[PDB]
Design a protein around this nucleic acid. Structure first.
Ligand SMILES: Nc1ncnc2c1ncn2[C@@H]1O[C@H](COP(=O)(O)OP(=O)(O)O)[C@@H](O)[C@H]1O
Ligand code: ALF
Ligand SMILES: [Mg+2]
Length: 512
DNA sequence: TTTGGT
């Protein structure tokens, strides 16, 4: 049941008119966007609405890719003129600009004007036009009192989206939803959150937020944890991995390939987001960090089911697709593993580097599969003929020396679940000659119980812990505390009335 | 202290 106000903003997009809506955290913005994305596709075709957002996880909430990933601009720190020449040299991305009828963009507060103007320049010169965006309908979404775009230099403040040429050209009104939905039970809580949107903590709200520094109820509901910087996040994801039953599976990065520099080259190789050492467990929660295909993108969340190799997986897949299979078909690949590679790879320079990656030793023992992974056959009267359960296990044991890789179940935007075997991807910073300067093979997965407050923006975390220990940018404490649905579900550490203040540029916007 | 690429 969408609200009347939420429904009208959807209709309004039938105008073709650029619309920009807003309203404090958790008002239904990104939900109604989902249905407006349905009508904009029904107007220009599925393939011609660009559904993007500022951070790849926030993109998945509305079912789409990052603004950079759609645009083809990479990081887009380059010259306005430069990016355009890069986009036009990619058929996929060129004709993507040629053909789009809408650009939906959610969590706009983290878009920086400098980039919007670059995208405007690209949208025009490619679409051969001079309208606001080469005439693309803009749907803009968010709350500017939440996180601003990331200022690397904090003595060049990064010029929020509305400071741009392109915005003043194409946004000449703001709509504003006012009813709050996320916290909708805890009314005092909402008022407490609203006076945090501005920096108006009083003597009483502080005391009431400090009452929330108690411990979350301890049950099997694993709580989400939000911290300011990536260190405390990484630390709390391990503090949860250590608490999870089972051994860790260490995945060690493969690194090359230019001559001897080490003053920053490992400052370059810690600076990859691809840890030199990635630990996982069965039942862990991971998030993809590389755009890999249409529905498996940076910001997909998943839960590791067990670890397999290709061959042990090809068999496991067979059984999920025929869950009442005759047990004979298995023993043919169980006890005749020559004919398994027969049936498997009949289905169709960097290949050797990702070969030696995740290679168990020729003799290292092989922990058997979990009995969790056979619960799908566990819907019960007469004849249990899961000898098949033991059969798979024998197949798994043959992977001694083979390449064992985490089998993840991902739950997509539309809650469509999809299981993939996560091969390693590779990262590289390359020169003008593309030379092997600095390379790293690694799994494109991160643990996802904890999130930086930035990646936390967009999500609803019913049970959540918040540690405002290092909060630095304006809005950061608002975004974090505003994730929780109830005070019951919330725990807050290190409350500091003075590290909670609002950006002046934005109050100026909301009144000039 | 933070995001973003294939
Ligand atoms: N029409 C609605 N009625 C009831 N609850 C809603 C409605 N729309 C959204 N919600 C809930 O409120 C929360 C906020 O929705 P969302 O669109 O993410 O807010 P935000 O505006 O901050 O992006 C969501 O978790 C959603 O479950
Ligand atoms: F803008 Al939001 F949760 F998507 F506050
Ligand atoms: Mg939203």
């Amino acid at each position: 049941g969408l609200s009347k106000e939420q429904e009208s903003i959807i209709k309004l997009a039938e105008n073709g008119h650029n619309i920009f809506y807003t309203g404090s955290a958790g008002t239904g913005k990104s939900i109604l966007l989902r249905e407006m994305i349905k009508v904009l596709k029904g107007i220009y075709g599925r393939e011609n609405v660009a559904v993007t957002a500022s951070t790849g996880l926030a993109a998945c909430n509305i079912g789409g890719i990052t603004i950079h990933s759609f645009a083809g601009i990479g990081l887009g720190k380059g010259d306005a003129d430069k990016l355009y020449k890069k986009v036009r040299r990619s058929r996929k991305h060129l004709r993507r600009w040629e053909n789009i009828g809408a650009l939906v963009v959610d969590e706009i507060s983290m878009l920086d004007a400098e980039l919007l103007d670059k995208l405007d320049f690209i949208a025009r010169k490619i679409r051969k036009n001079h309208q606001p965006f080469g005439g693309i309908q803009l749907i803009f979404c968010g709350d500017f009192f939440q996180l601003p775009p990331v200022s690397k230099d904090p003595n060049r403040p990064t010029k929020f989206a509305f400071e741009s040429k392109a915005w003043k050209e194409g946004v000449k009104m703001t709509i504003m939803l006012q009813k709050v939905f996320r916290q909708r039970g805890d009314v005092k809580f909402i008022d407490m959150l609203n006076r945090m949107r501005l920096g108006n903590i009083d003597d009483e709200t502080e005391r009431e937020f400090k009452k929330l520094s108690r411990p979350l109820p301890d049950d099997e509901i694993i709580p989400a944890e939000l911290y300011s910087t990536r260190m405390e996040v990484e630390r709390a994801n391990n503090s949860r991995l250590s608490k999870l039953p089972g051994q860790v599976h260490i995945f060690n990065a493969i690194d090359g390939g230019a001559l001897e520099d080490e003053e920053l080259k490992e400052r370059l190789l810690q600076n990859f987001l691809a840890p030199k050492e990635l630990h996982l467990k069965v039942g862990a929660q991971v998030m993809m960090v590389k755009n890999l295909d249409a529905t498996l993108v940076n910001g997909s969340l998943g839960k590791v089911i067990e670890f397999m190799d290709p061959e042990t997986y090809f068999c496991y897949e067979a059984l999920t697709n025929d869950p009442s299979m005759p047990p004979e078909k298995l023993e043919t690949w169980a006890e005749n593993p020559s004919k398994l590679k027969a049936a498997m790879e009949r289905e169709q320079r960097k290949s050797s580097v990702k070969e030696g990656f995740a290679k168990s030793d020729i003799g290292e023992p092989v922990s058997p599969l979990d009995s969790s992974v056979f619960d799908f056959m566990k819907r019960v009267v007469l004849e249990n003929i899961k000898r098949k359960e033991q059969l798979m296990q024998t197949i798994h044991q043959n992977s001694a020396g083979k390449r064992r890789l985490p089998l993840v179940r991902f739950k997509a935007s539309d809650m469509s679940t999809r299981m993939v075997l996560v091969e390693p991807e590779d990262w590289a910073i390359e020169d003008e000659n593309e030379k092997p300067l600095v390379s790293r093979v690694q799994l494109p997965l991160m643990l996802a119980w904890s999130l930086s407050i930035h990646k936390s923006q967009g999500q609803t975390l019913p049970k959540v812990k918040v540690d405002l220990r290092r909060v630095f940018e304006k809005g950061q404490a608002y975004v974090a505390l505003s994730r929780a649905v109830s005070r019951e579900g919330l725990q807050v550490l290190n409350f500091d009335r003075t590290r909670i203040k609002a950006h002046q540029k934005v109050i100026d916007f909301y009144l000039t």
